[model samples]
Target: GHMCDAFVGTWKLVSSENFDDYMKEVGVGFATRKVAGMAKPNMIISVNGDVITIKSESTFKNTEISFILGQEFDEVTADDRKVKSTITLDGGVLVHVQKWDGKSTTIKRKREDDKLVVECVMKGVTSTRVYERA
Candidate 1:
């Protein structure tokens, strides 16, 4: 129960901002960018011991992945998306390791009132999103 209330909710994508450029830089088609830009993904995180089950699902795809904090693992994302990553707590921040042609990202989130603030960042592209209790 150490991670109780740490992460559990329906997180919605608020802003792709410059991440649109990053996706584009990765050769993602404009259509995918447009769809992903409007994507409202939900991340439900369940923690047991040092492991966290991250169920990231969107209007487009769904992914179920498990990992331990500070440890590295290879997971294929939903919809055949692939990446090898390591998640670590950097002063309460979530950092990741990605090896796709796209940029590596460090996702950060913090509880704010009745909402969770999420930010996805890599290179010059930074996308921020917010999700309220659902």
Candidate 2:
């Protein structure tokens, strides 16, 4: 099966666990983390040829990124951190990695049942966010 086919729709965040600590590990400021923690962003994913785009929309901030699989690119995150970002497909999971100032984080997204499950990891902290089709 084509990897992009597994994630070519809009998903609305339903629940999140330990997201605050995940943001803290990424060095998000206190004020930003407070707002970010409460934001339930909708993820919109699309593909055109070899390029894939992912958009995060929320009241706090909206962020979008487009990249080819395995290609690294510069990204400015919602918290305003500049990082090197790369995305790849492992099996049916979309694996996203971001690195900046000697810190790195991983976010793995996959479809489970009728929901989209996202697992975020930084250092020893890990968070999980679940989304439903929107």
Candidate 3:
């Protein structure tokens, strides 16, 4: 197994910072941004052989993504954008990149001292969401 084993488990959102601004950079509308900003989502990560699944659950909405390392795939994002996405493991970090309409974003997930730190970046804005094992 790859080092992705560190990410396999249920993680509960503990804190979020600058998510609203990050969504704005992604061109998310006002209503959707408002609702999504306030969401405290639980991230469920699992791995079966070469495929890894990440399921996000929130009171507002739920979404899931499954992918193999270095493979690109079509994805319909929570913000309703259809994009090409890829995930690659860089050391202990899972680097996810999404591209659409000539724009791109990167999300990095890494485990740090018993916490899962998710960093989302689009253009110049960056948001961080922290999670603890549930």
Off by over 4 Å in 3: none
Alpha-carbon TM-score of each model against the true structure: 0.78, 0.96, 0.97
The lDDT of each candidate is 0.67, 0.93, 0.94
Better of 2 and 3 by TM-score: 3
Clashes of 3: 0
Residue 13 error for model 2, in Å?
A: 0.3
* Candidate 2: worst-modelled 10 consecutive residues by lDDT: 1-10
Give me the candidate number with maximum lDDT: 3
Query: How high is the lDDT of residue 131 in model 3?
Result: 100
In the range 102-122, model 3's lDDT, one tens digit per residue, is 999999999999999999999
Q: How are the candidates ranked when ordered by lDDT, highest leading?
A: 3, 2, 1
Q: What is the Cα-based lDDT of residue 31 in candidate 2?
A: 98
Candidate 2, superposed: residue stretches over 4 Å from native: none
Model 2's TM-score against the true structure: 0.96
Model with the higher lDDT, candidate 1 or 3 = 3
Q: Pick the candidate with the highest TM-score.
A: 3
- Which tens-of-lDDT digit does each residue in 1-134 have in candidate 1? 46436566556555445667656554567777787766678778777777778787788677887888777788775434477778876765566665665546566767777767767666657666777655
